[model samples]
Target: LTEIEHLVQSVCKSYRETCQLRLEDLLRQRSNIFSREEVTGYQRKSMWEMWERCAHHLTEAIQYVVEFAKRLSGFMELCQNDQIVLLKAGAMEVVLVRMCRAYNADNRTVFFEGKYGGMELFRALGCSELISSIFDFSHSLSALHFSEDEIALYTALVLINAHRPGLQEKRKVEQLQYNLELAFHHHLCKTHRQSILAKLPPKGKLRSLCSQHVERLQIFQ
Candidate 1:
């Protein structure tokens, strides 16, 4: 009887089944390197290796996001180009959003490979400022303690951006975006306070973060 209701169900379940598998647990597995070695700053080879390792993880996360999107009701029916466009523009944003799940706020560290890495681990990458930005975002996000459903609804809204440039069927994307927002609003009404509204992830912040992340990738690549 309620399409939006079912949409929320699938969206939440898909994320739990897909990203939750790796995103939640993979980051926590402590690696041997950090445990045994004296991790230091900015070795050329080590920095290159770290970038490669992070890139590999990011690639896997993106794949799960694609799978999560496909499982979203009505997403598969979108034109192929539209799907590509949405993914190209929004996948990193969702990845960063999902990252809070693995973030350790108390220590101000992010899980990398097996061990939780602090600012020092990333110093060699020459993006300490960007890392700080990411850590801050994750700190704010994790503080909300949003449920899986809330995060899922938010991710659906992130991926379904109607204003994204080059959408072949903007109206269709807008319709889906509206439906997602309705689901988001409905879910929140039952579980959260009104003030939490302002606490949600800012789209502009995510965009800037993405740009900076890409800049790092380009310089390192």
Candidate 2:
């Protein structure tokens, strides 16, 4: 078994080295294709585009992670662990989802509607089914508990971001207000609720901060 392990490790190392060499060669070949000014311009544009794309995809990735946490929560529950591992996992999922939704909402003001022609280049990527599976797992875990205010807040935030443009003006504001209240109430349930509430601004301020820092990238852009 030790000999087999060593053999496997050696083969994996060789394969990685070969792959790195090939990638370096490809990059070197492409490097000389553009003049310095052209390269600089492309680099700047590419950087911005990459950042935008990554911001969008990061939300998706967070959702995926939440779903995974939900599943782990369920598994821990089934194991009858004494640590309330499941509850902790559920809480983490709620926090991550909330953060992601906030970021998504803020990002949409600038990044969502833009025409990224390169989107088609990623069309053939086959991750939708995997994402769907993650959601399914999350839903299963969610069904086990009452829909907490945090979950409701996250859900409403997603809807607000996704379909806000089409929502009736009065209804949109009302819904936003309702969800914000729920989120606040949920925070009050935490052990450090008073501290958290005192530290956090109201919903409007939260939205503004999220918009400026995350979506607009005012600090880095």
Candidate 3:
């Protein structure tokens, strides 16, 4: 029995090591440089395929961890009559904590900064409102999985942020209209809709807001 238990443990450890190495290799292959500066955004069709592959691998790793936990539980139940169940559960708890930390570390590069990395580049292009509206539309889609109200509010802020100098006056108005249309189409139309559609002041309101809230950042130059 003792020899069998040792063999099982060794096999499980080998599986864990092999899976971890494979996960590392997959991550090394993941890259964001799918386009040049002239072309800008990713080629959606190709990018989607790549994203699907990465997501599949990530899911597989998580599933492996879950399966390992189940196997460990069964092993503990059959082997040690002592608190082996608790021991296996504690091991799983540690694994979950490590998983969360790794996920956060990996995603923070894209989401933790003041802006979502270069995702807000449209702000520099004076098209922040358009980006916001697109996100609003995205938020409405099943892919976004955010509350309608939250999406609307986030879109509003994006529009407000776009009000900067050197932007075409007509384009600004058009962008605002575009965002409002997105909100309306997404079932975000409400009493606040009127305020959202109100005309922009002659001067950019974002400058003032930035001075107050984001004084250090020189988004407007």
Candidate 4:
């Protein structure tokens, strides 16, 4: 491993520690943020009860993302205008999906910070197929049984910035991605002999035309 690899491994270490501080602390709290009559019990009312419940409960949904951006090597090196541009571009998507990491979907409930809603309930709340797409995928990833390290690396990969409209030292971002890929690959190669992450083998066409989410952007450019 080179400096890049070393730095990322360091990042992964700190990330895992910070991650524990963030996640377990939240998990220990009660999962009852969905009550209808919350905002008025105290001196607070601007907070939408449901929305507040949703945001506070789902802190990890941010790409490893929202938190990962702060750790970006070149983030502060950018021109001030460029920083705003990058955050705006990729901030919105991938969140609800990402939170699926620890959730149990079979019961039709999220480990929501939390809720008792089923699929229809979420749809009633204006959630669309995005929830299901992630619902399915989150289950799959859990099945894969990725390690804490792999997950951090996965998120780091997800955090890779690409194709953003405005970025300074764009290749530096790509280099960061490449370094992470190297770490991820090396991790896989050294691990349990057959803990292989199998690919689908391109056996058939998709049931529908697909739009993929580029979590870890692999750019050949």
All candidates' lDDT scores? 0.78, 0.34, 0.33, 0.49
The superposed Cα distance between candidate 2 and the true structure at residue 80, in angstroms, equals 43
Quick one: how many clashes does candidate 2 have? 0
Which consecutive 10 residues in model 1 have the weakest lDDT in total?
Answer: 30-39
Candidate 2 wrongly placed segments (more than 4 Å): 1-45, 58-97, 100-192, 213-221
Over the stretch 35-127, how does candidate 1's per-residue lDDT look in tens digits? 324455333446677776667777788898998888887789889999999998999999999888877777776776566766567766667
Query: TM-score per candidate, in order?
Result: 0.87, 0.25, 0.23, 0.61
Worst 10 residues of 2 by lDDT: 103-112
Query: What pairs collide in candidate 4?
Result: 62-65, 62-66
Instruction: Residues 1-221, candidate 3: write the lDDT tens digits.
Output: 45434433443353454233333443353343223442244223353343444344434544554444344312223223222332222322222222221221333212111213223433333435643543333232323232334332332233222233333343443454354344333343433334333332222332232223222222222
Predicted candidate 4 versus true structure: per-residue lDDT over 108-202, tens digit per residue: 34454243333433442243574575566555555655566666665555445555556766776676667767776777776762353463111
When summed lDDT is taken over every stretch of 10 residues in candidate 4, the lowest stretch is 200-209
Better of 1 and 4 by TM-score: 1
Q: Clashing residue pairs, candidate 3?
A: none
* lDDT leader: 1
Residue 123 alpha-carbon offset, candidate 1, angstroms: 1.1
Candidate 3 regions with alpha-carbon error over 4 angstroms:
1-51, 75-107, 110-221
The local distance difference test score of model 3 is 0.33
